[PDB]
Amino acid sequence: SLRDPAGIFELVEVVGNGTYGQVYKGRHVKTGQLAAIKVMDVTEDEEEEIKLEINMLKKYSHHRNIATYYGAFIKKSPPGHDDQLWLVMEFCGAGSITDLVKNTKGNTLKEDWIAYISREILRGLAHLHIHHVIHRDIKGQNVLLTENAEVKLVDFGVSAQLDRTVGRRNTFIGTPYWMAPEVIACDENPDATYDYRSDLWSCGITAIEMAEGAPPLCDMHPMRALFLIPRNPPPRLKSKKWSKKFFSFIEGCLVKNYMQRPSTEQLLKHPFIRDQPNERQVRIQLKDHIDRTRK
Amino acid sequence: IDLSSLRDPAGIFELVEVVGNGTYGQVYKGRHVKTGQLAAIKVMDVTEDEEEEIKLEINMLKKYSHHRNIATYYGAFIKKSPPGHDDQLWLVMEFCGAGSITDLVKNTKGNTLKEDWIAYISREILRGLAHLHIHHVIHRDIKGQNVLLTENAEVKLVDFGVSAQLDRTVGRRNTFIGTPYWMAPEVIACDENPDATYDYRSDLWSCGITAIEMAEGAPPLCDMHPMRALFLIPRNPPPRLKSKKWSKKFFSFIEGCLVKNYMQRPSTEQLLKHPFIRDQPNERQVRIQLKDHIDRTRK
Numbered sequence: 001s002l003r004d005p006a007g008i009f010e011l012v013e014v015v016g017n018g019t020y021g022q023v024y025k026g027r028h029v030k031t032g033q034l035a036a037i038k039v040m041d042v043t044e045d046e047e048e049e050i051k052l053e054i055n056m057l058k059k060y061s062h063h064r065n066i067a068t069y070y071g072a073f074i075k076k077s078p079p080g081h082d083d084q085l086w087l088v089m090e091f092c093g094a095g096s097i098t099d100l101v102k103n104t105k106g107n108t109l110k111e112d113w114i115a116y117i118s119r120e121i122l123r124g125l126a127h128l129h130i131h132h133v134i135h136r137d138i139k140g141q142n143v144l145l146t147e148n149a150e151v152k153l154v155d156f157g158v159s160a161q162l163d164r165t166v167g168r169r170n171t172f173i174g175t176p177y178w179m180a181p182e183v184i185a186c187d188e189n190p191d192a193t194y195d196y197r198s199d200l201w202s203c204g205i206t207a208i209e210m211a212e213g214a215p216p217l218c219d220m221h222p223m224r225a226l227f228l229i230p231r232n233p234p235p236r237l238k239s240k241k242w243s244k245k246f247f248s249f250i251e252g253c254l255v256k257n258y259m260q261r262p263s264t265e266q267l268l269k270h271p272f273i274r275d276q277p278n279e280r281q282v283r284i285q286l287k288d289h290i291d292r293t294r295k
Numbered sequence: 296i297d298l299s300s301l302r303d304p305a306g307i308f309e310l311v312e313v314v315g316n317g318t319y320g321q322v323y324k325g326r327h328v329k330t331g332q333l334a335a336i337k338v339m340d341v342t343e344d345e346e347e348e349i350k351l352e353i354n355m356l357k358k359y360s361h362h363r364n365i366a367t368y369y370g371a372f373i374k375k376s377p378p379g380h381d382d383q384l385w386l387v388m389e390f391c392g393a394g395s396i397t398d399l400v401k402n403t404k405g406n407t408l409k410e411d412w413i414a415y416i417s418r419e420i421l422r423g424l425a426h427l428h429i430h431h432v433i434h435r436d437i438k439g440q441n442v443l444l445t446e447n448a449e450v451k452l453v454d455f456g457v458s459a460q461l462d463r464t465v466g467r468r469n470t471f472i473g474t475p476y477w478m479a480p481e482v483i484a485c486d487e488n489p490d491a492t493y494d495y496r497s498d499l500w501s502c503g504i505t506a507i508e509m510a511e512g513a514p515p516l517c518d519m520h521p522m523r524a525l526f527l528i529p530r531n532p533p534p535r536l537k538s539k540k541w542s543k544k545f546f547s548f549i550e551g552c553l554v555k556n557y558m559q560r561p562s563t564e565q566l567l568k569h570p571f572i573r574d575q576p577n578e579r580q581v582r583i584q585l586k587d588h589i590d591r592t593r594k
């Protein structure tokens with residue numbers, strides 16, 4: 001009951017990849033409206049799981065800080081080949097905040113840009129949490145901007161639920177640098193699970209990434225980072241130039257033990273997030289920066 | 296064919312069509328302009344600054360010759376994009392058109408291969424690994440997906456430059472942890488393994504997980520979230536086949552590859568003398584059955 005995308009959506013060009021498959025800029029054939037399309041090989045036995053995932057993705061993406069999910073499709077392939085799942089969502093033209101910080105001189109964003117982006121993240125997270133959804137994959141590549149300097153979350157955890165063989169697309173662990181300590185199983189933490197507060201740790205790491213251009217432990221092998229995170233104290237900003245408010249917000253996101261980590265609503269009331277005077281001009285500064293870099 | 300340089304591929308190799316998706320960039324069918332020889336090309340975006348790193352890694356490349364069980368690695372190229380724009384790294388490798396062992400087992404009834412097929416494929420894997428190992432090179436990614444077939448039923452290891460592991464380090468891929476299922480305990484850092492060592496015997500563990508994958512169509516723990524499996528691999532005892540139909544030789548072989556402590560794991564040569572691998576009476580028939588199966592599949 002998932003259809004071929006032919007005549008409905010079509011691929012335009014790659015915008016990025018990693019993990020598994022790639023993401024294209026895509027187009028709704030009949031209106032010319034853009035979309036992002038995630039394309040990845042799947043077996044036909046995955047189909048039942050996909051319909052559950054897409055259903056969840058659509059239901060929870062109707063908030064201004066989440067990229068809205070449009071639909072999923074399966075482009076059947078000739079005998080022998082695997083069919084391609086196409087996952088179709090809102091196109092975010094300005095790209096990821098990881099890209100942003102990369103294309104910015106100094107690999108560092110102004111403090112008030114960081115406060116604005118982090119609030120937008122928290123609001124998106126707030127929406128998901130109240131609906132009992134853990135994002136579980138927060139990081140710079142999963143935070144996107146529109147042409148109009150709007151901020152949107154993408155790729156919140158759906159699945160795995162189904163007591164099935166996990167499909168290839170879900171068998172890859174991914175970059176670990178944004179993962180909370182409690183999420184990484186060890187002797188004392190054998191069943192290590194997500195908690196909504198797991199996303200808040202990730203938002204703190206994303207904030208450091210905006211400040212320094214890379215997450216903590218970036219000079220280490222990913223596997224070794226996996227080992228260190230549950231053992232290390234909370235990461236810290238390296239420069240002292242930042243405001244007392246910024247330091248305190250980082251401290252809040254990065255509370256080692258998640259039991260005393262603040263909730264999403266609490267961080268939204270944190271002075272660094274809550275009190276933002278130059279908002280309007282931030283937007284404009286962001287808007288203008290985006291244009292400069294496209295060109 | 297040059298394995299120490301890094302030229303633009305213009306007028307040398309050209310892309311003709313996307314053939315599939317490897318780890319993690321796209322794999323094209325390509326041909327060498329001047330000979331018309333087919334090749335698989337793995338393509339990856341890289342930043343200007345990554346290109347100095349790439350140079351260092353090419354210097355670290357170890358040299359080894361062709362071998363009938365290794366898809367030949369032809370070398371690397373950087374295709375330049377206009378300034379500002381990210382370039383592409385091209386990794387060129389011998390083309391094999393008959394799919395992977397994973398394709399092979401997934402396209403059977405019951406997702407399972409005959410024991411004499413597994414013995415045959417496993418030996419070919421081990422032979423390729425011996426050649427690598429004797430030249431001081433670790434493959435690092437032994438698994439069904441990375442074991443390919445030709446139209447002639449030749450078994451060959453994927454080699455997009457295993458000495459340098461470029462297809463796993465460039466364009467941020469170095470930040471990824473991939474799939475854990477075929478990993479040896481020693482590559483997984485855990486409370487008892489602060490620094491995850493890769494050893495040549497790591498491949499032998501993975502060859503053992505691959506024989507299980509041939510026998511059951513999937514690696515152990517395939518039902519777990521990869522994070523949960525990552526934790527379990529260093530802690531569980533050696534995995535084993537589910538069914539009991541299998542011969543004692545086959546059970547013994549799996550046991551031989553899957554020693555938890557790599558220091559106590561056999562070497563490639565030792566494992567090539569395992570009776571499961573060493574004694575293959577129906578060898579020629581097997582290769583026939585294989586050649587045939589391949590053909591009917593193209594049809």
Ligand SMILES: Nc1ncnc2c1ncn2[C@@H]1O[C@H](COP(=O)(O)OP(=O)(O)NP(=O)(O)O)[C@@H](O)[C@H]1O
Binds near residue numbers: 018020093
């Ligand atoms: N809706 C979108 N609009 C514009 N760009 C996008 C969109 N979704 C993803 N991208 C970009 O495409 C590139 C590939 O993203 P993706 O395949 O999701 O990998 P990832 O985010 O780095 N890891 P993961 O989400 O855990 O699989 C990233 O740079 C994304 O920011």
Ligand SMILES: [Mg+2]
Binds near residue numbers: 064066067068
């Ligand atoms: Mg939305």
Ligand SMILES: [Mg+2]
Binds near residue numbers: 141142143154155
């Ligand atoms: Mg993304």
Ligand SMILES: [Mg+2]
Binds near residue numbers: 141154
């Ligand atoms: Mg993503």
